[PDB]
Design a protein around this ligand. Sequence first.
Ligand SMILES: [Cl-]
Length: 118
Amino acid sequence: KVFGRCELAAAMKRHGLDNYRGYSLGNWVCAAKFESNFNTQANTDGSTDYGILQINSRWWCNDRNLCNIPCSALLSSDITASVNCAKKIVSDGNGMNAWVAWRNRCKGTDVQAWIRGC
Ligand SMILES: [Cl-]
């Protein structure tokens, strides 16, 4: 499943990411756009970032996994386990700066523009 922007915005609001750990919905939508282009199935060091948030296996999944899920569970058409693992990740202490693409592209911009027009 490759989502659309509004479709995705609605799913993320559904799983309760609008203002989660401080971050408004746009930050999340903005990150999915540049990490996966909204594709729900997507080395260099360890191996493999999985899914629409592109969660790295070295740490978060097993393919000691921190989120307590397999990495296959970051590939289905619904985004539910992804979002749960996202929820643990963003509360390590580094926030959304975990996601590189978020730090270089979304941080500081007008991120509400990603939830305007839906
Ligand atoms: Cl934070």
